[PDB]
Amino acid sequence: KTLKFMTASSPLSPKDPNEKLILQRLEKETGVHIDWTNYQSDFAEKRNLDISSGDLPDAIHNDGASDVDLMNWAKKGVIIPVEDLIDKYMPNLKKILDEKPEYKALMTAPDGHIYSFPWIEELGDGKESIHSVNDMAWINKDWLKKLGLEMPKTTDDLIKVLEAFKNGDPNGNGEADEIPFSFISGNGNEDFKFLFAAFGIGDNDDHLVVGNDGKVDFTADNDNYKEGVKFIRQLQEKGLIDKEAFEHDWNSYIAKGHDQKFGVYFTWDKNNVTGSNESYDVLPVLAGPSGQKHVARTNGMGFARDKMVITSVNKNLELTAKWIDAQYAPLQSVQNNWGTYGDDKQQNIFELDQASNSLKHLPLNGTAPAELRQKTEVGGPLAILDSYYGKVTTMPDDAKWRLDLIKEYYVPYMSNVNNYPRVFMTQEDLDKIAHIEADMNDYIYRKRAEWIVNGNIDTEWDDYKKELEKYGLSDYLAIKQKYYDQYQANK
Amino acid sequence: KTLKFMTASSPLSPKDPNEKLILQRLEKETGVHIDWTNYQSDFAEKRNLDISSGDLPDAIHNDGASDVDLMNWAKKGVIIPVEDLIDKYMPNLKKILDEKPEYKALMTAPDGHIYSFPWIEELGDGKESIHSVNDMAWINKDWLKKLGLEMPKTTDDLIKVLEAFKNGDPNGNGEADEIPFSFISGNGNEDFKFLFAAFGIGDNDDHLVVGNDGKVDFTADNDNYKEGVKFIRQLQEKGLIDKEAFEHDWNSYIAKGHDQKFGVYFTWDKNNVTGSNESYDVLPVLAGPSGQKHVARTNGMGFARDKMVITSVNKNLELTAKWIDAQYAPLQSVQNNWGTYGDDKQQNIFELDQASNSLKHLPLNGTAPAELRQKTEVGGPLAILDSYYGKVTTMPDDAKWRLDLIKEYYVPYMSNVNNYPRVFMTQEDLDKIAHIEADMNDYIYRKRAEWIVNGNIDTEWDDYKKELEKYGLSDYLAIKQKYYDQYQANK
Ligand SMILES: OC[C@H]1O[C@@](CO)(OC[C@@]2(O[C@H]3O[C@H](CO)[C@@H](O)[C@H](O)[C@H]3O)O[C@H](CO)[C@@H](O)[C@@H]2O)[C@@H](O)[C@@H]1O
Ligand SMILES: OC[C@H]1O[C@@](CO)(OC[C@@]2(O[C@H]3O[C@H](CO)[C@@H](O)[C@H](O)[C@H]3O)O[C@H](CO)[C@@H](O)[C@@H]2O)[C@@H](O)[C@@H]1O
Ligand SMILES: [Ca+2]
Ligand SMILES: [Ca+2]
Ligand SMILES: [Ca+2]
Ligand SMILES: [Ca+2]
């Protein structure tokens, strides 16, 4: 009858998730009422507080936990193994894992157990994966045209173009309101790290790529990365960087984007920032000063190990497992991921075709894709397989488009045969890595920021590398190299 | 004979705590060898990692956990109550708690147990507490004298003075190397929030004061606070602020301070930043534009609830309790807190007068006090009572000095009769407060930095306050108000 789930949702979505049409239909379909503890900001901290305080729900929905957390909770008995529950009570999920046993391998821990229910979304594979590049660079072609400038081909062209943006008044309003270059610094889709590949090798949110000699390379200690920092520093020194880039947030970023104040900026999809217009387009991959022309691959993929865990206080394992398996029904997975049909007081992502019992995406008509999706999606455990497109649902227009942009612009320069595989380390190695990352992760971005605002990377670089080593960088690399080699060896 | 303790220490101190002279003597005296897990950066993250993974020591030394963490560990049985241990095995601590019963109340959770062993240090009381002000403002008096300027007495004087620092080349090298105004943004001793009181009410690291009407006031939604942000924004607009003030760190901060580049800066004690010299002095309390002249009280005090917890895996509670009780011996408490004597090669904070069997502070002769302290102190649970001064130990000279500065400059303008008492809330209230602070704490500083670097506080202020309310601010204050009323109803 009733289950208590903790969940994570967008602050744009309703405070009570049961107000969402998907979940209203679901309750009428399953006969299960969910009482939600719905965290719309700082989910992970508030979740951890719940776990540390012993105030556990029946399950944690849309969880997104790290492997070290996943394993610590399992060893402590906070969550339970679920492989028997899958085999007994979950025919939708069992069909997917049995059809595609590699996903089943991705879910299994070193101890042979499965502890969580994944998100699977098949959009491209290998270099052509939609996740291959997250922080795409976009440029205002309209300003290029007004200033009579060609699309820049080199990093030196980019500097000249940004100077024209800063001083040439391309909007025509007689004010220096143009922001030549902007980003949200850190991890994620709005960072500038995409341009570091123009100096060779590049960078990603893991700071980790895989060389064609099969060696894992920590990127944030490469000379090429030092050179990428000096280039951004050059833009800062020339007054080309958004004066707010190191303090502003998403809301401010898109407000300037909507007003079309950006010359060059970074995001996943321009339609979320500068909108549905032809004024902005992909910045083509640039050659560096020595002719480097490269795109570093992320280690992202259409798979997330944990979008649901079941706690040890859960009162009705069979009911819970069956509820979760309804989320892996194809029509349900598609909707939970992307939105739904037939709302009367809200725009709809889908229309339902009753004749074929299938979903068809509707045109967004200017609405930001991320905005409507986060209002109406549900998140959580689900699977979208390649065989579903054209049968269960259409492929989203924005997904089709981005896949093609990655093919056209980036794949020709993704010269690393491999990226880092999604491995599931032992608790012992997870713990060691977690201790190291507790020092390293913030430190890297802090130093990066300080070097762009000041300009002392030349005198601080070697000390920085020694700090990383003290934090345990070469043990870090050894562990990652170890799992890479194991992954290759058993392929 | 052997116990495993986790501890936190300065990165200036030896990696193995047993290299410290205090602990080498402690081992001879107690016959107990401690095997240390010593974290010198990110102690709390790495401690939490150890707890989450079940890698528990016998005890956590110098722990400093928040109340919510304490009660959560207690409820889940990570740590044990210790009141029976105190009664059965700890005559020094028992002697302290009976001569000073208010600390016993401060150690006791609402469920009637004691869960940790405190740090106690008596240096002033009430408004004269050495903790009443943490981020004191300091000003280069040499520059005032070279420029023929009077000490500023208003916020409008301060701007004029800072402008004279920026342009007037008061260090006389013909270059604009003077940094008029600098700080390390956030909580703690180097932040600038001390100046917000010149606009009435002011601010502290809790963003919480207590009005003379007995009502708790959240400071960061007051118009006074908005005016304080607008003042710092004016200094940013006039190019008066350190260009890396929101990027740099303590080491960079004190490197610039050692070079005497600062006009006005913030720290606990100038001897740690600009050194032991008369070039710098207290910045007197400033009158604001409307005549506001105020010092906001912090809620700090000479008491920390948890500098040691005992874990549920601890094998030898009697041995542990007696070892902890040795730390509460008066001569041992003083040394664990402040440093030691008799090191024939290294500098010493103390000499041991063996006739009187008491400690006397030594002149450091240029050495910053905090630097020798963090190399040779031990931390952990300890008590220094006011009755010890003149009997067990000298009062530190830099402490007497800071205390005199607080009386002379700040106490006349600390017009709040109360600050917020150190209450021990229920676990249910602790956990509710911690959910709200997960949202508010970072938000408050992020918006403040943003507003100083852009200039849009006036158009974002109301949305900012609605956001604070969405995060639960009124619930936050009602809880804080309940405990304050309950406190006053009991004294
Ligand atoms: O390019 C569209 C295509 O990309 C995918 C990749 O999985 O969506 C990811 C994308 O969505 C994420 O962010 C939104 C908004 O926060 C969130 O609602 C969603 O759950 C996320 O997966 O990220 C951008 C911007 O964040 C969104 O525009 C986009 O939906 C894929 O699902 C989609 O078809
Ligand atoms: O003013 C001297 C007087 O202040 C006290 C207050 O408790 O010390 C606080 C003070 O110590 C802290 O910081 C040092 C160095 O990081 C650390 O070793 C120590 O354990 C901390 O309590 O903080 C400043 C610097 O922040 C130090 O100069 C000073 O020691 C008191 O103990 C001392 O007598
Ligand atoms: Ca313009
Ligand atoms: Ca490297
Ligand atoms: Ca000068
Ligand atoms: Ca208020």
Residue located via tokens 């072609």: A141
- The encoded tokens of residue B27 equal 């081992």
B287 pairs with which residues across the strands? B154
Q: Which atom of ligand 1 is nearest to the CA of A374?
A: 18
Number of residues in chain A: 491
What residues have CB less than 8 Å from A70, skipping those under 6 apart? A79, A109, A115, A116, A305, A306, A309
Query: Are B229 and B342 in a shared domain?
Result: no
Residue of B nearest to A448 (CA): B247
Q: State how far the Cα of B233 lies from the Cα of B241, in Å rounded to an integer.
A: 9
Whose CA is closest to A387, among A120, A22, A132, A91?
Answer: A120
State which H helix or E strand residue B209 sits in: strand B208-210
**Strands B59-61 vs B33-39: parallel, antiparallel or unpaired:** unpaired
- The encoded tokens of residue B253 equal 């901060």
**Strands B2-8 vs B33-39: parallel, antiparallel or unpaired:** parallel
B139 pairs with which residues across the strands? B264, B281
Contact A63, A306 (CB under 8 A): yes
Q: Where are the beta strands (DSSP E) in B315-468?
A: 350-353, 358-361, 382-384
Query: Does A217 belong to an annotated binding site?
Result: yes
Q: State how far the Cα of B402 lies from the Cα of B121, in Å rounded to an integer.
A: 15
Report the amino acid identity of residue B347: Q
3-class secondary-structure state, position B70? helix
Contact A224, A200 (CB under 8 A): yes
Task: Name which of A45, A438, A450 is nearest B247 (Cβ-Cβ).
Answer: A450
Nearest CA to ligand 1 atom 16: A370
Contact A206, A214 (CB under 8 A): no
Tally of CA atoms within 13 A in the half-sphere of A313 that contains its CB: 12
B358 pairs with which residues across the strands? B353
Nearest CA to ligand 2 atom 14: B370
**Strands B208-210 vs B216-218: parallel, antiparallel or unpaired:** antiparallel
Q: Final residue of a domain: which of A334, A364, A392?
A: A392
Q: State how far the Cα of A450 lies from the Cα of B242, in Å rounded to an integer.
A: 13
Q: State how far the Cα of A431 lies from the Cα of A68, in Å rounded to an integer.
A: 6
Residue located via tokens 């025919």: A91
> Would you call B31 exposed, middle or buried from its count of C-beta atoms within 10 A (0-12, 13-18, 19+)?
exposed
Q: How far is CA B319 from the centre of its chain?
A: 32
Is residue B272 in contact with ligand 2, taking CB distance under 6 Å?
yes
Report the amino acid identity of residue A33: H
Query: Are B388 and B399 in a shared domain?
Result: no
Query: Are A104 and A227 in a shared domain?
Result: no
Please tell me the total count of domains within chain B: 2
3-class secondary-structure state, position B39? strand
Residues with CB under 5 A from ligand 4 (ion): A 217-218, 221-222
Residue located via tokens 């700040």: B410
State which H helix or E strand residue B180 sits in: strand B179-181
A304 pairs with which residues across the strands? A119
3-class secondary-structure state, position B266? strand
3-class secondary-structure state, position B429? helix
DSSP string computed for B360-382: EEPP-TT--HHHHHHHH---SSE
3-class secondary-structure state, position B383? strand
Residue B204 DSSP symbol:
-
State which H helix or E strand residue B309 sits in: strand B308-310
* Whole-angstrom Cα Rg for chain B: 24
Residue B76 neighbours by CB distance under 10 Å: 16
DSSP string computed for B158-170: HHHHHHHHHHS-T
Contact B178, B170 (CB under 8 A): yes
φ/ψ region of A171 (left if φ > 0, alpha if ψ in -120 to 50, else beta) reads alpha
Q: State how far the Cα of A195 lies from the Cα of A298, in Å rounded to an integer.
A: 13
Residue located via tokens 């879910």: A107
What residues have CB less than 8 Å from A95, skipping those under 6 apart? none
Whose CA is closest to A384, among A336, A321, A351?
Answer: A336
State the helix-helix crossing angle for A457-471 and A473-489, rounded to 10 degrees.
Answer: 60
Whose CA is closest to A192, among A156, A235, A221, A150?
Answer: A235
Backbone angles phi, psi at A2, to 5 degrees: -135, 140
Contact A307, A384 (CB under 8 A): no
Contact B72, A53 (CB under 8 A): yes
Contact A261, A177 (CB under 8 A): yes
Residue of B nearest to A73 (CA): B52
Contact B26, B5 (CB under 8 A): no
What residues have CB less than 8 Å from A335, skipping those under 6 apart? A22, A341, A350, A359, A378
Task: Name which of A53, A247, A450 is nearest B75 (Cβ-Cβ).
Answer: A53
Q: State how far the Cα of A305 lies from the Cα of B315, in Å rounded to an integer.
A: 38
Whose CA is closest to B428, among B113, B118, B111?
Answer: B111
A389 pairs with which residues across the strands? A393
The ligand with the least distance to the CA atom of A180 is 3
Q: How far is CA B184 from the centre of its chain?
A: 14
- The encoded tokens of residue A24 equal 């209203």
Residues spanned by the domain of A6: 1-122+302-392
Q: Final residue of a domain: which of B392, B421, B438?
A: B392
φ/ψ region of B390 (left if φ > 0, alpha if ψ in -120 to 50, else beta) reads left
Documented resolution in Å: 2.0
Query: Does A350 belong to an annotated binding site?
Result: no
- The encoded tokens of residue A205 equal 């949110």
Q: State how far the Cα of A45 lies from the Cα of A42, in Å rounded to an integer.
A: 6
Q: State how far the Cα of A140 lies from the Cα of A161, in Å rounded to an integer.
A: 11
Helix residue ranges per DSSP H, B80-180? 83-89, 91-99, 101-107, 141-146, 155-167
Backbone angles phi, psi at A290, to 5 degrees: -95, 5
Number of residues in chain B: 491
Q: Do B439 and A252 touch (CB under 8 A)?
A: no
Q: Which atom of ligand 1 is nearest to the CA of A272?
A: 28
Q: How close is the nearest chain A Cα to the Cα of B448, in Å?
A: 10
Report the amino acid identity of residue A208: L
Q: Cβ contacts (< 8 Å) between B471 and chain A: which residues? A: 41
Q: State how far the Cα of B9 lies from the Cα of B377, in Å rounded to an integer.
A: 9
Residue A465 neighbours by CB distance under 10 Å: 15
- Three-state SS sequence of chain A: CEEEEEEECCCCCCCCHHHCHHHHHHHHHHCCEEEEEEECCCHHHHHHHHHHCCCCCCEEECCCCCHHHHHHHHHCCCECCCHHHHHHHCHHHHHHHHHCHHHHHHHECCCCCECCCCEEECCCCHHHCCCCCCCEEEEEHHHHHHCCCCCCCEHHHHHHHHHHHHHCCCCCCCCCCCEEECCCCCCCCCCCHHHHHHHCCCCCCCCEEECCCCCEEEHHHCHHHHHHHHHHHHHHHCCCECCCCCCCCHHHHHHHHHCCCEEEEEECCHHHCCCCCCCEEECCCCECCCCCCCCCCCCCCCEECCCEEEECCCCCHHHHHHHHHHHCCHHHHHHHHHCCCCCCCCCCCEEEECCCCEEEECCCCCCCHHHHHHHHCCCCCEEECHHHECCCECCCHHHHHHHHHHHHHHHHHCCCCCCCCCCCCCHHHHHHHHHHHHHHHHHHHHHHHHHHHCCCHHHHHHHHHHHHHHHCHHHHHHHHHHHHHHHHHCC
Is residue B373 in contact with ligand 2, taking CB distance under 6 Å?
yes
Query: Are B268 and B153 in a shared domain?
Result: yes
3-class secondary-structure state, position B42? coil
Decide if B54 touches A, using CB distance below 8 A. yes
Q: State how far the Cα of B76 lies from the Cα of A55, in Å rounded to an integer.
A: 11
Greatest pairwise CA separation for chain B in angstroms:
70
Q: How close is the nearest chain B Cα to the Cα of A454, in Å?
A: 6
Q: Where are the beta strands (DSSP E) in B41-155?
A: 59-61, 119-121, 136-140
Q: State how far the Cα of B449 lies from the Cα of B236, in Å rounded to an integer.
A: 11
Residue located via tokens 């180097």: B190
Residue B123 DSSP symbol:
S
Q: State how far the Cα of A174 lies from the Cα of A164, in Å rounded to an integer.
A: 14
Decide if A434 touches B, using CB distance below 8 A. yes
Q: How far is CA B384 from the centre of its chain?
A: 17
Query: Are A265 and A166 in a shared domain?
Result: yes
Q: State how far the Cα of A305 lies from the Cα of A444, in Å rounded to an integer.
A: 26
Backbone angles phi, psi at A359, to 5 degrees: -95, 140
Q: State how far the Cα of A335 lies from the Cα of A379, in Å rounded to an integer.
A: 9
Contact A424, A391 (CB under 8 A): no
Query: Are A82 and A1 in a shared domain?
Result: yes
Buried b (16+ CB within 10 A) or exposed e, A431-440: bbbbbbbbbb
- The encoded tokens of residue B94 equal 């028992």
Contact B180, B263 (CB under 8 A): yes
Residue B18 DSSP symbol:
G
Tally of CA atoms within 13 A in the half-sphere of A58 that contains its CB: 19
- The encoded tokens of residue B120 equal 């106690």
Q: Cβ contacts (< 8 Å) between A185 and chain B: which residues? A: none
Residue located via tokens 């190291």: A436
Write B480-486 long-range contacts (CB < 8 A, 24+): B480/B208, B480/B216, B480/B420, B480/B433, B481/B215, B481/B216, B483/B423, B483/B425, B483/B429, B484/B210, B484/B214, B484/B216, B484/B420, B484/B421, B484/B423, B485/B214, B486/B423
Report CA(B177)–ligand 5 centroid distance (Å).
Answer: 5
State which H helix or E strand residue B232 sits in: helix B223-237
What residues have CB less than 8 Å from B462, skipping those under 6 apart? none
Contact B334, B384 (CB under 8 A): yes
Whose CA is closest to A261, among A190, A185, A163, A182?
Answer: A182
Report the amino acid identity of residue B23: L
Is residue B189 in contact with ligand 2, taking CB distance under 6 Å?
yes
Q: Cβ contacts (< 8 Å) between B55 and chain A: which residues? A: 431
A350 pairs with which residues across the strands? A361
Tally of CA atoms within 13 A in the half-sphere of B430 that contains its CB: 21
Query: Are A446 and A388 in a shared domain?
Result: no
What residues have CB less than 8 Å from B476, skipping those under 6 apart? B218, B433, B436, B437, B440
Contact B431, A37 (CB under 8 A): no
Query: Are B289 and B172 in a shared domain?
Result: yes
Residue of A nearest to B73 (CA): A52
Contact B97, B104 (CB under 8 A): yes
Q: Final residue of a domain: which of B377, B392, B407?
A: B392
Query: Are B274 and B217 in a shared domain?
Result: yes
Q: What are the pocket residues of ligand 1 if the criterion is a CB atom closer than 6 Å to any ligand atom?
A: A 121, 123, 130, 268-269, 272, 369-370, 373-374, 377, 396, 398-399, 402
Query: For chains A and B, what is the number of CB pairs under 8 angstroms?
Result: 85
Q: State how far the Cα of A317 lies from the Cα of B265, in Å rounded to an integer.
A: 60
- The encoded tokens of residue A421 equal 């595989």
Contact A14, A24 (CB under 8 A): no
Q: State how far the Cα of A52 lies from the Cα of B48, in Å rounded to an integer.
A: 10
Query: Are A9 and A98 in a shared domain?
Result: yes
CA A73 → CA A7, A84, A303, B2, B431, distances in Å? 17, 19, 21, 30, 20
Contact B280, B203 (CB under 8 A): no
3-class secondary-structure state, position B241? strand
Q: How far is CA B155 from the centre of its chain?
A: 26
Contact A249, A184 (CB under 8 A): yes
Query: Are A213 and A64 in a shared domain?
Result: no
A234 pairs with which residues across the strands? none
Residue A101 neighbours by CB distance under 10 Å: 9
Query: Are A441 and A469 in a shared domain?
Result: yes
Write down the experimental method used for this entry: X-ray
The ligand with the least distance to the CA atom of B175 is 5
- The encoded tokens of residue B47 equal 């401690």
CA A85 → CA A74, A256, B426, distances in Å? 16, 49, 38
3-class secondary-structure state, position B188? coil
Backbone angles phi, psi at A82, to 5 degrees: -125, 5
